[PDB]
Amino acid sequence: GAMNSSNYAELFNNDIKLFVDDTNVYRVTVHKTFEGNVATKAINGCIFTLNPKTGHLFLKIIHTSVWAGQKRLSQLAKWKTAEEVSALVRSLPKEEQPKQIIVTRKAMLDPLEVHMLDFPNIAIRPTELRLPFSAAMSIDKLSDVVMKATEPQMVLFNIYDDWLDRISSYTAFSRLTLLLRALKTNEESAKMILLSDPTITIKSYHLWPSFTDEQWITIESQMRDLILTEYGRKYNV
């Protein structure tokens, strides 16, 4: 059934699973027209498909051309997401195919189930967790590849960098969700925290800075402070 806090360690067992987040598939800016009406302009988006045990991120870039001449784009985007996830699964060798796909939004359940009818043994599940994957577009290297794309493109990343050489998947996922939650709550301040020390750099082959174990503890505390600080600003606490 649905994935929640009760069965949370299941994310880090040896059954291959993927999270699918569709928040950033259909992206738009709203502008006034010369006549004073409102119109949208679609911008490039992406599907965020993540293996939480290994950190492998399958980032399918959604180029604005896929919306041309189509209607009901917010509905279409869920079906396009499901089409692309289905295509990804079929492209993987059998022993790499997931046993479960967890969608971050319940509106993805029927589109994905229908696209995956050929895989009756892959469970399609929602989650009670509020995960901050919408903030993926706040990771500079991910935003850059999405915005530069001139055609549909799949790009592969490890969203944990080399962390699994030193920490467990459970701890890596906790750090990722803390970083993303901070970037979602106050992007400017989160990026300030991450880069305020020019001596710690981001390797060319990485997404996040090369913090030592002690520095990650400090960074993580600063992110928790930021989240708490913003919570107090929001609710006047």
Binding site: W79, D110, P111, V114, L117, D118
Partner: protein
């Protein structure tokens, strides 16, 4: 007009005949039902006074044989049987009529209700849904499961309705996933009508039979089937005009006949609100929408 005689009525029972019903007392001198209209299927059904568990009954057509009811004290129910000796049967009926030991099928001349509920229902199609080839009549009861219910346990005692599943490979063409899920016209017109049922009359016959088994026996799987067959049409953008007009008539008479006090258990809120107010056919069922809004405005 035809007759279904009863050997006797040893146990107190409510007897239904089509949309009518009457109470028979324990050992009352009751010997059957006369003046049954020729030309339609009929259903004769039972609910025991001492155990309302299991409504059960028999679908039959008097043009196919001479049928009678006889209580079986071992199996504890009223059973339908065929009498092959025609002269014996005519004699029995004539004597029971002469002694006035029979109730008359109480059809009002103006009243087309039974025709309107059974217009497309054929005994030959009933016998394919309810498999028991050695009899010309078909037994149905409250507890019988459908072939689909069993997939999700005795198959010889099942209701073999046509399986309808909106999230199945049968319903969804590879490469048309969104199209086929949001518009069921392919599944209705090509798969079901052209492919399985052959024509709309057979589709409507199964729909009508499912409704009647739901209403007369409280058969839950039949209710599921009835609603699935409605939703399949209403969720198709492309339906022949003559089917939509006929569906409105079929549903209108079904809603008209349903007991007001059984609405809570025989009508699915989701399906009806979807069909009348959100679906492609939300504006094609004028007669059905009007009776539903006036009779069951709570459900909506």
């Amino acid at each position: 007009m035809n007759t279904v005689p009863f050997t006797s009525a040893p146990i107190e029972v409510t007897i239904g005949i089509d949309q009518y019903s009457f109470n028979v007392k324990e050992n009352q001198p009751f010997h059957g039902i006369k003046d049954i209209p020729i030309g339609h299927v009929h259903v004769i059904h039972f609910q025991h006074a001492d155990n309302s568990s299991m409504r059960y009954g028999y679908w039959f057509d008097c043009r196919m044989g001479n049928f009678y009811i006889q209580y079986d004290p071992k199996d504890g129910l009223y059973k339908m049987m065929e009498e092959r000796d025609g002269a014996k049967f005519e004699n029995i009926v004539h004597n029971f009529k002469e002694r006035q030991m029979m109730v008359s099928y109480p059809k009002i001349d103006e009243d087309d209700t039974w025709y309107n509920l059974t217009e497309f229902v054929q005994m030959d199609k009933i016998r394919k849904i309810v498999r028991k080839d050695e009899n010309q009549f078909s037994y149905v009861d409250s507890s019988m499961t459908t072939v689909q219910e069993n997939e999700l346990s005795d198959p010889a005692h099942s209701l073999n309705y046509t399986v309808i599943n909106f999230k199945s490979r049968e319903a969804i063409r590879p490469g048309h996933e969104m199209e086929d899920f949001l518009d069921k016209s392919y599944y209705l017109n090509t798969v079901m009508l052209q492919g399985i049922f052959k024509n709309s009359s057979n589709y409507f016959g199964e729909l009508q039979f499912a409704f009647l088994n739901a209403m007369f026996f409280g058969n839950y799987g039949s209710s599921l089937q009835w609603h699935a067959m409605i939703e399949l049409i209403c969720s198709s953008a492309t339906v022949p005009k003559h089917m939509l007009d006929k569906l409105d008539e079929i549903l209108y008479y079904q809603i008209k006949t349903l007991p007001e006090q059984y609405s809570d258990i025989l009508l699915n809120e989701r399906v009806w609100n979807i069909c009348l107010y959100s679906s492609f056919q939300k504006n094609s069922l004028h007669n059905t929408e009007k009776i539903m809004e006036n009779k069951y405005p709570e459900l909506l």
